[PDB]
Amino acid sequence: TDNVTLNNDKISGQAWQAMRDIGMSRFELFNGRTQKAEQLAAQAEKLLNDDSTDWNLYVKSDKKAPVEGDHYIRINSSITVAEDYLPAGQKNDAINKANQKMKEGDKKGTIEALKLAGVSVIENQELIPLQQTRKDVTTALSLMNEGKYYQAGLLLKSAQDGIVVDSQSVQL
Amino acid sequence: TDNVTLNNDKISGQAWQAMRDIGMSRFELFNGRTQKAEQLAAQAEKLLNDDSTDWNLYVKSDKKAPVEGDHYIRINSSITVAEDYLPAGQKNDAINKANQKMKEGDKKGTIEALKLAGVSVIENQELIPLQQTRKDVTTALSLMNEGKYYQAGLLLKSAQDGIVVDSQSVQL
Amino acid sequence: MTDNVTLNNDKISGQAWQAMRDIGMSRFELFNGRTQKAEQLAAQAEKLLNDDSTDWNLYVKSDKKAPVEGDHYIRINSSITVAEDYLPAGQKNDAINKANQKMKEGDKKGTIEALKLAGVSVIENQELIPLQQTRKDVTTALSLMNEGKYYQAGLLLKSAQDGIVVDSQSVQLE
Amino acid sequence: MTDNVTLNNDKISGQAWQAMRDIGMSRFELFNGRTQKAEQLAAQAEKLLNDDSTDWNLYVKSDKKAPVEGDHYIRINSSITVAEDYLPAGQKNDAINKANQKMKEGDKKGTIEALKLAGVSVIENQELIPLQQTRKDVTTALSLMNEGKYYQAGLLLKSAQDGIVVDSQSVQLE
Numbered sequence: 001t002d003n004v005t006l007n008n009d010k011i012s013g014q015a016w017q018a019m020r021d022i023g024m025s026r027f028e029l030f031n032g033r034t035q036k037a038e039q040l041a042a043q044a045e046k047l048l049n050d051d052s053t054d055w056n057l058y059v060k061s062d063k064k065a066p067v068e069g070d071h072y073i074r075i076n077s078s079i080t081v082a083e084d085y086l087p088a089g090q091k092n093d094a095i096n097k098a099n100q101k102m103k104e105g106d107k108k109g110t111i112e113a114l115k116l117a118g119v120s121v122i123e124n125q126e127l128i129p130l131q132q133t134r135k136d137v138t139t140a141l142s143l144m145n146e147g148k149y150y151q152a153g154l155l156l157k158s159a160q161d162g163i164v165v166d167s168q169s170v171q172l
Numbered sequence: 173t174d175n176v177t178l179n180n181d182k183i184s185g186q187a188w189q190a191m192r193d194i195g196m197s198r199f200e201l202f203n204g205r206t207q208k209a210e211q212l213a214a215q216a217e218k219l220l221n222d223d224s225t226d227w228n229l230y231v232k233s234d235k236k237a238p239v240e241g242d243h244y245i246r247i248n249s250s251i252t253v254a255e256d257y258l259p260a261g262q263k264n265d266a267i268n269k270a271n272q273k274m275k276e277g278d279k280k281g282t283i284e285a286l287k288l289a290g291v292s293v294i295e296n297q298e299l300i301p302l303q304q305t306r307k308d309v310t311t312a313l314s315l316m317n318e319g320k321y322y323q324a325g326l327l328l329k330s331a332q333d334g335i336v337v338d339s340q341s342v343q344l
Numbered sequence: 345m346t347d348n349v350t351l352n353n354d355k356i357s358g359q360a361w362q363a364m365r366d367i368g369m370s371r372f373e374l375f376n377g378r379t380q381k382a383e384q385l386a387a388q389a390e391k392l393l394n395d396d397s398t399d400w401n402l403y404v405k406s407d408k409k410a411p412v413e414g415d416h417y418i419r420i421n422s423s424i425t426v427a428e429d430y431l432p433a434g435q436k437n438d439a440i441n442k443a444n445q446k447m448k449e450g451d452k453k454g455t456i457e458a459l460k461l462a463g464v465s466v467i468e469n470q471e472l473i474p475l476q477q478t479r480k481d482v483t484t485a486l487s488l489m490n491e492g493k494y495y496q497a498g499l500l501l502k503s504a505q506d507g508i509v510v511d512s513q514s515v516q517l518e
Numbered sequence: 519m520t521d522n523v524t525l526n527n528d529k530i531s532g533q534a535w536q537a538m539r540d541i542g543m544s545r546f547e548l549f550n551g552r553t554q555k556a557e558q559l560a561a562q563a564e565k566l567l568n569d570d571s572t573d574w575n576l577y578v579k580s581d582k583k584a585p586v587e588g589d590h591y592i593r594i595n596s597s598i599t600v601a602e603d604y605l606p607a608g609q610k611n612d613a614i615n616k617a618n619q620k621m622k623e624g625d626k627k628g629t630i631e632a633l634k635l636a637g638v639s640v641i642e643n644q645e646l647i648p649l650q651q652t653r654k655d656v657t658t659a660l661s662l663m664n665e666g667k668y669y670q671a672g673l674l675l676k677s678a679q680d681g682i683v684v685d686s687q688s689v690q691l692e
Contacts, residue, residue, distance in 0.1 A: 003199075006202065027251050029274055030251050030279075030282065030293060031279065032273070032274050032279045033277065034274050063513075066514040077199065079199050079325075080506060081325075083499075084484075085480075085484040085488075099319055099321045102202070102322075103206050106204060110202065119322075120411035120477070122509065132427065135429065147272075149274045149275070150267045150270055151430070154428075158428055166511075167510070168409070169411040171409060236688050237688060238639035238640075254651070257662075292585035333599060338686075340582075341583050343583060351550060371598060372522075372596060374598075375525070375621070377623070377625060379622055423542060424549050440670075444667060444669055447548060447549070447551055447668045448666060448668070455549060493618060496614075498600075
């Protein structure tokens with residue numbers, strides 16, 4: 001399933017699951033189960049090339065991908081808080097306000113109430129370069145079809161090293 | 173589903189999925205969807221306390237958990253290789269031997285052939301303390317039932333910081 | 345503690361890098377029962393970070409909004425990630441030789457182009473900290489140590505470290 | 519570069535820590551078109567790691583099998599992870615005060631017990647490297663730099679860094 005960032009940008013659940021599959025496929029090479037490795041690599045190839053999927057939904061438009069003509073897409077998002085010192089009594093009142101804002105679904109009000117609590121919020125967006133990752137998966141399957149399993153492991157690993165984490169303060 | 177380490181120790185797919193749920197639940201707090209946060213926290217509570225599950229299957233017996241009477245369990249495993257220098261021609265022959273061993277399902281022969289290629293293999297086992305994590309999830313749900321959403325976020329984060337990565341050279 | 349530069353020649357604060365190292369060591373010594381050593385380490389970080397003979401604008405990454413109003417991210421480290429496409433070895437080894445010559449020549453843009461021909465993409469990982477927010481964490485951590493509130497000081501030092509972010513960007517020199 | 523100790527008082531190599539820092543910087547300078555500076559950094563790491571006036575046994579973590587036959591993991595850094603159970607604040611703040619006094623007193627075992635009463639578990643993260651395998655990576659990286667094979671040298675420096683492992687263990691002093 002798809003999730004969303006705080007600014008409501010879509011996150012690809014399929015590409016996330018394909019990154020999980022790629023990592024398992026590499027493990028199964030070393031585990032001596034080469035056919036399960038190929039199946040896992042194939043599932044990631046299908047997840048990443050699904051023509052039903054609208055891949056433009058997940059593109060992070062303001063980040064230049066390594067290869068020309070490629071794009072980064074979002075595959076996960078997580079939260080980092082950083083608390084500054086505040087007297088506990090004034091912080092508690094501020095957090096109470098934040099909690100009511102979360103219950104109200106007010107995202108911007110949540111960030112603002114948290115700011116008054118000395119709390120800042122970073123959003124870490126995990127990204128992959130879609131076409132680079134597709135090419136890594138396809139060449140890896142080609143190497144598996146040649147019996148070059150270690151070399152396929154190298155390509156799968158490369159796809160995983162292509163993941164970046166873009167950490168940005170929250171601006172709504 | 174369950175996976176296995178190289179020595180064939182079982183890995184808990186449910187606890188893995190509960191760690192993924194915990195992290196999403198914390199995000200949804202900040203995202204201002206407190207009820208989806210509670211549902212995600214509840215799914216992790218059910219995954220982690222399933223009495224159908226044989227939790228002793230996943231225990232890492234030789235690692236002392238923080239809290240007394242608790243145990244670490246395995247929730248993931250991945251591979252790190254470290255290549256030493258070898259002339260390319262003698263390495264290629266060694267990798268050929270390794271690839272045939274992987275095709276043969278011979279794990280120990282794979283590690284040995286890889287050694288002759290200058291390649292060593294580390295297994296990173298991701299672990300969680302089961303009862304500590306259960307308690308974190310339950311208190312977090314209690315705090316959500318009191319409307320203390322930020323404070324529940326703290327407990328969910330603590331569960332995630334409890335994850336350790338045990339990296340060990342492969343011995344079969 | 346001496347400065348370095350990114351691939352684009354932007355300055356990197358070695359003082360700020362050393363403060364973050366001291367902050368980590370300071371927190372450890374708290375739990376190690378050496379609070380006096382913990383304070384000297386945090387005091388070292390505070391004076392590294394607040395040096396008013398240093399021109400902190402040299403280190404700012406201006407295209408990144410800091411969490412706290414009026415703050416800025418500064419560069420404290422740069423590292424390299426490569427990603428290798430599969431290539432006919434002869435074609436790759438040939439372009440690697442070219443990229444090696446460009447590195448000898450000090451030709452950064454030639455190095456990136458040659459590595460492209462070798463199927464190699466280069467990412468530059470810039471480690472950043474929010475300057476003023478980090479100074480405030482250290483200063484208040486020091487106050488807490490002087491008040492004997494050692495566990496609480498460790499909380500603020502940890503929070504300073506969690507402010508470190510890594511900006512991974514594909515290399516574009518021209 | 520000076521040594522420290524773990525919570526259990528086992529020695530930590532500051533020389534090895536500094537070599538790993540130099541190895542990272544050396545790889546960066548390769549791509550930065552400063553190969554001469556890259557070699558000096560790797561040469562610094564090699565002589566830090568191979569110092570035969572240093573007693574490398576002091577740093578060995580004997581309960582951890584290194585990947586290569588006859589090698590050993592050595593400690594290059596220690597850090598702290600805490601995990602806090604939810605506790606009635608009054609009960610927690612009370613035990614934190616006790617833990618703060620134990621840290622002032624330099625009483626490591628008292629600090630751990632007091633923190634337990636506060637719902638706080640302490641993990642010590644020990645960063646390790648395989649000593650001989652790391653020396654070999656650096657030495658051959660230097661050879662590759664002298665042969666003008668700069669990209670290939672970066673491969674070996676990267677491989678040295680990927681040998682770093684973190685042993686996270688709950689704190690047990692008695």
